[PDB]
Amino acid sequence: TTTLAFRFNGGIIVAVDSRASTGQYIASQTVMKVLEINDYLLGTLAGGAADCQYWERVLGMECRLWELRNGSRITVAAASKILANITYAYRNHGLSMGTMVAGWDQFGPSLYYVDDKGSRVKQDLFSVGSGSIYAYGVLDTGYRKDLSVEDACDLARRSIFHATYRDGASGGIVTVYHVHEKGWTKISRDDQTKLYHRYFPS
Amino acid sequence: MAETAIAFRCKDYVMVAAAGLNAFYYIKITDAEDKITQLDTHQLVACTGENGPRVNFTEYIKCNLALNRMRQHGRHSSCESTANFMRNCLASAIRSREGAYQVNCLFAGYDTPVSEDDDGVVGPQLFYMDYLGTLQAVPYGCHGYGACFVTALLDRLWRPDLSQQEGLELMQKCCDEVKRRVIISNSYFFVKAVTKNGVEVITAVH
Amino acid sequence: MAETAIAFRCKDYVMVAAAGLNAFYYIKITDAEDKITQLDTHQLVACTGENGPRVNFTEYIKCNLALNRMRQHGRHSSCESTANFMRNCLASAIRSREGAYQVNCLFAGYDTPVSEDDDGVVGPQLFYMDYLGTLQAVPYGCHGYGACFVTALLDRLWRPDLSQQEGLELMQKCCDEVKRRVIISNSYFFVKAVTKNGVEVITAVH
Amino acid sequence: TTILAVSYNGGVVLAADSRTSSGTYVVNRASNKLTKLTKKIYCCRSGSAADTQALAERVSNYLGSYQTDIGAGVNVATAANLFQKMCYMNRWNISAGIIVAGYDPINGGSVYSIPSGGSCVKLDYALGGSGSIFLYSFFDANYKPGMSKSECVAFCQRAVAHAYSRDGSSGGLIRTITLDADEPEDQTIPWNRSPYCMEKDPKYVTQATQNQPFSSSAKITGNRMSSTG
Amino acid sequence: TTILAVSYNGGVVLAADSRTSSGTYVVNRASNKLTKLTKKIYCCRSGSAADTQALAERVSNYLGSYQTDIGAGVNVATAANLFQKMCYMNRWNISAGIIVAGYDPINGGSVYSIPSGGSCVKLDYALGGSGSIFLYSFFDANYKPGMSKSECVAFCQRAVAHAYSRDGSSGGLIRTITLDADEPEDQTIPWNRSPYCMEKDPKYVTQATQNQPFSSSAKITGNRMSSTG
Amino acid sequence: WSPYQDNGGTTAAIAGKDFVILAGDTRLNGDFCLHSRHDQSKIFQLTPYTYMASNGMQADRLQLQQMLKYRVKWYKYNNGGKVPSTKAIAQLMSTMLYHRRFFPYYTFNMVVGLDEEGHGVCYSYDAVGSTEPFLYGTRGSAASFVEPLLDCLINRQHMTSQAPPEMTKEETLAMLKNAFTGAAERDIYTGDSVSFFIITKDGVQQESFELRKD
Amino acid sequence: ASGGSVIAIKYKGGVLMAADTLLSYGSLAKWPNIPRIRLLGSHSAVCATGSYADFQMMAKQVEDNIERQKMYHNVDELSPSEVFSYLHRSIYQKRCDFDPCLCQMVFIGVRDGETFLAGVDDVGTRWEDDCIATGYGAYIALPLLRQALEKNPDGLSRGEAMRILTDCLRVLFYRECRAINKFQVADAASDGVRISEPFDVETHWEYEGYCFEKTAII
Amino acid sequence: TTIVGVVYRDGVVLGADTRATEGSIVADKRCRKIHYMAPNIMCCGAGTSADTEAVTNMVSSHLALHRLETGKQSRVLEALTLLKRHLYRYQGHVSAALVLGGVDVEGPFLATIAPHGSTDRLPFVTMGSGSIAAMAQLEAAYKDNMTCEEAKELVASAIRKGIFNDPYSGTQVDVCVITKDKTELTIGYDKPNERMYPRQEVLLPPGTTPVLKEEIRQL
Amino acid sequence: SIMAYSGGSVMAMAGKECFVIISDNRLGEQLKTISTEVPKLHVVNDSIVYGLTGLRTDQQTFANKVQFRTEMYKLREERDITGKAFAAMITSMLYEARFGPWFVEPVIGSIDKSTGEVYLCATDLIGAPCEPEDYVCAGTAAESLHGMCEALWRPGMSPEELFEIAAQAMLSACDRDSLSGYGAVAMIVTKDKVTTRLIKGRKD
């Protein structure tokens, strides 16, 4: 499993693979590792799939309740704080979940990483999962704030591809989302082998 | 313990510095994460530990201090009172079901007369805090792998009447020593100071 | 594994780099220790591991190569032969009483025609070697915590026909990535190269 | 510990040894393992002394109140059920083997075995303790059902003596109690008057020939008991 | 496993069960645990089958050569010493309890016990195996030294039957062999003709009263063996 | 003593255009013996259009089936007799599996049925309820033997040929019969007979397929 | 106290269930006169392999439930299927509380023509078949019972079922360590369940290969 | 694995299954477990296949050398002694449970050798994981002095009991009859599990799998 | 485990007068792909092709030992070793280290150049042989390979049909395996010629 998300002048880019491997056997190649919390917030799948799915569904329910009670959308700082509080309450219950909350509230774009022990960090670039060690090498080398939307999407897709090429636990279909002020759009969904033939032609 | 925090108190100020390291195993997640939390206008804590417990403990302490200020009509608490409150929290944690806070603290502050009737502490205050609930007033203190490396250095070089610039140079030397002798990469050190005017974020030393 | 070794082979050269870290459980003993041992005039090995086994293995291999050259009247051995000799030594170690060599190797060399009758390899040669006795010819290889970080980077940027200066820039990028993403401090990287003229110690990249 | 209970036509006889041992040292050599529950119902206790004492005291307290509540006597089955329930609810925390034996006017003499597992079996005779393992083949060969009261008491004493002659964890006094329609009668016979022990057995008088004198022949001629000879 | 050996005036009688069991399943129900060493010397084996078989084969090989070397017969003490040495040098790697019993013209009939520890004790009678624990009190009460040959054989068979009636690891055929100055004579009696078992014992015919019918009284009236009744 | 036990067996579902083919091997075995060759507890009908299939512990799936049935009946009571849809039952299964996250059921489940448009859908779960939809799926002891075969014949990857037309009920049933026949000859814990449930809008039909008894 | 193996087979007209009358304490054959088959209701019978205390408590709980329900309300007596369902649910509930009923139970019953035979584990596994066995009867007797059933799929007569049941009991006595040659067979028929008196099977120990000289290790 | 041996009127009948399981998966469906020891001696094996094959081959070679030395036919007791000494020397780590059957001048000889080295000579024996279910059949139908047909049918039935009640056994019954003069080994004596529901045989035309390079080398 | 540390899978399949032996290309360290161009096949002579699977260092050491043994055999015995003799020699070599076992699992295919009979073998790590008439397979994707071969193989295949079946089975088995993949390499051995092919696979 390899996931990445970075902040640039133009919003946030999120990118995922689609492989779930129960040890050595490949369980599935169509897993959705981007969890659409709402039409304005995005979450990521890493670690225990059931834990992430259930708790980000809980987070989406709490965000909808926040909107209903208060008449306005929740901020990403508050949404990430809810997940972090929930996770910290269960830090001794053996949860396994590493997620990223990316959104565009009234204070611009914002990205948080929340682990399974209640940690909640706010930086402009994260890579999560067993393939992150391969993404960072491609991602830290080409990342810059003044990237175009197309350039940022290309960088994220290339980093995820290079993660899937060397990591046995990562693979499937590379999916790229872009979070902007109007919400998020699924930018792309491309097969990894076709990505290899596109990048390394001939 | 991987991240080193340094603090030393002088005649007119206390300087603290905290490594900004965050890691998942051997991977450096980030190297710029502020681990110095300002509790009051003239109080702060430099905390070492993993993000969850550290953030929860600091936010709990800060929220309780703010609530006390609200219920006491803006009466600011002394450094000793806040330090004892943190110590009581940490000591209560180690005998609770949820377990102890895996956070080591250097609490710095400056005491000012709250009113004309006040006759308490006026200089700067520094406190060393273990995760088990130990509290000790020290002229200087350190946490992390580099702590000992700094401590002897301070024993060699610290003076009670150091100036702000000479204190800045001393903190730069301590951070350089930590970078030189610790295998764990602490590239950035997030230095802040407490003076009679409050908390200042010092960017010269890092 | 704490210390990261990088190697990549181009059309006319092989560049290797080895972190100079030496530590005692969290203490940086030194950061400038050459872990690249020159075996022959056109052969070298970058070895990761603790000092004892690494030094013993490299000295054993170098002494055996020198003895073979003596008993063969100055006939220099090919890169494949030396790599297979090292692989046999490592594989024999893992089934011996004294145990396996806890050393990971990147073996680099340049093959030249020993005589006019020679019809063997002429370009550069690079071999990845696991401590268990694995041997694999690779265009580039890496060991240590940063290895994966470099590998994908190489998969992004390596080309077969890179020049010496562009290869130097690529190695600088790899070392910068290792320093950026690995919590273990690898400040100095000890870069060397093998070309048709032999072994050169490159000081520009570190 | 050796405990047993045997039913005859009138009632029951309960027999036990007197030895509480901390592994290999005799902490008590005059224990009383026949514990009164009601006037005509007793229990033989084996295993943990504290656990069995607490169980017996609780059951006796429960039975004493029950007599006052109903205004009549208690059947042996009621006490057996009380022990069975209390031992089954605590089977993982206690080490106890119980024999519940007594007389009631409705069912005559009754004997119940409640092993460590917590079951309850109604039997003509029951054995328990570490020394019971030596008595099973003794009962299969020498025990005939339908003995008289005195015959049953004598057989129980002989069985207990044979049991602790071989069991190191059992020994000391032999305590018996007879429970029937008449007044219950107890008896304590000491070790020096025991019906059996290997020390007085004539077939174990001759010592094994182990210390051969140095001889010029392979003929075995007894142990060497003298320096000169 | 139940093995024993008893000495009478002329020689010895060796008795054993026939059951090799892998814990709770009967791998063999017609085993022969009386292993020939010489013509007049045998051993009863208990414990690990492979270890005891190897020990007996090695000792028999050693004794057969010794007869040819000395040109005379072998005393029972020599075979006992051979087993004692071989079991003492391997006491940590083998699981074996040996009884060495036989006849020699010099010392008559001899019985030796070599337990798992590796010692050697010369005895009038010896018991061994898991089922031996049931026989000790059987020998203390029913065994009288000085029986005749036929009496000794009958007593050994009765003791083996009583032993495996209670031992789950013992059962099947009863094998006896008589060793004396005459020709050694073997005998194998089956289970259906055994001198004792609890199935034919009249005192265990009546079943324990456990399945009470639902009744309006506390009187115990037997088990419920029919739906209507 | 352990509160868990694996009874073996394998299930497999393939979702068609307007049908679902569910299948489960009827074989229940204990420690090393064979409890029965005609165990039909693996496949459970929740609604006329939704079925569940479980592998692993038999008692755990019996309990889970009872819980699902009573939750569905409560839903029918609380929604005016409206039967829950396949996706609602899938989400409910995930939620209830996760509720017992600290003492998990030893079941691997699949929820199959028709969509609102009538097109067949399959859902697969881990022990703690990680749901994932798909068009086919195999669970149990022989999953690794038949899942790659379904991958090759359905996805038709690494084939330089035009994709054949989409399979009907008969071809899907024949393919699944071949998959189970192949699994029963190489996996020792599966195969006495396979129960097939063909779920369409015009009711559900049941069929039984013979396998080897060794 | 632990019980041995239990076997049961359905014949054309009812069910038969056989078990030995022995409770053991480890390897000690402690009590050879124990009636292990217990009658539940007026239609069913049960016998458990394993712990006897747990079986006693569970049987008491089940029998109290039937009689109290029949007595308190003017309702029909519970069907054997319903009794077995209650037993299985109780066993599973004990398992989920980490206080299991460490027994393997065989359950038989007949009501108004329909025959019911089932088995349940200590952890909640339940199954129904034409032949059930617990303990070593599952490995020893069950293959023979299945072969006898499959040699005539029209159904076994009572005599044919009894013959193969006695054959399986004989083999169990041959090959099971903690067993005795004393068995009871309960017959569940239309009129009700009837438990027979204890009996024994005839054994054979006179094979020519069993002699002293052929089995000797010289 | 289920291996069975039976002594009948004149000779020994051995039987085995043919399924070999590569750790809970069927590797080969027609494995051979009745091994050659001598012209008059055979040995079925169960447990670690490598250990059984190695020990049987070694003892058979030793027996062949010994018959070259002596000039007589090999005795079953000699093979039994060699096998038991070798198995005991390794303290059971050579995990091979053997059923040895032969005929000598002293008549039929059937025995079992445990992996630890213990031996039991019996008229009828079973070994393997499905041995118990096999043994229950032998205890139910064995009688002294059976004819060849009765012994063969009993062995086949006992093997089938392990075939259907043990997941590790099946797919055939191998039967070997050993007499004083002749030793016959039937492989397909019983095939209860036939081939049902044949394959679809879906065709893949040559060229459906893309090829990156190709090299043809004529010989 | 040690056998799955390096990854890799090999499978041999029997035609009429031919056999196809195919190996994956991946070499890795327990999750991380060291190289994607490491076939596991070895040619002994014109008739025998065998592949090794397991710990890569053990694969290389055992291959060197086998090369030594076959060269010595061809020097001493003036002839090429046969498939059955080669398999027996591997069995003996593997059983010599019965308690110090090599961590390989060979897959041997051979054909008689004069007769045309096809011999397949696949031993365990201690040499326990296995000689079926349809197919053998070893590696991390052994279960999937077994399923695909059982579902696709038929007795009377042509070399081309056999190659297509083997390629499809190998690719489909590697798709479900995280330790195997990156294309394949296949060898079709007939009575008259030997063909080597490289088969496209996923780069995952």
Ligand SMILES: Cc1ccc2nc(C(=O)NC3CCCC3)cc(Nc3ccccc3)c2c1
């Ligand atoms: C910000 C960050 C960076 C790297 C992360 N790396 C791994 C990870 O598994 N790395 C592998 C092991 C060591 C090298 C490869 C896991 C992470 N979060 C996480 C994922 C799932 C559950 C809990 C936490 C990360 C988060």
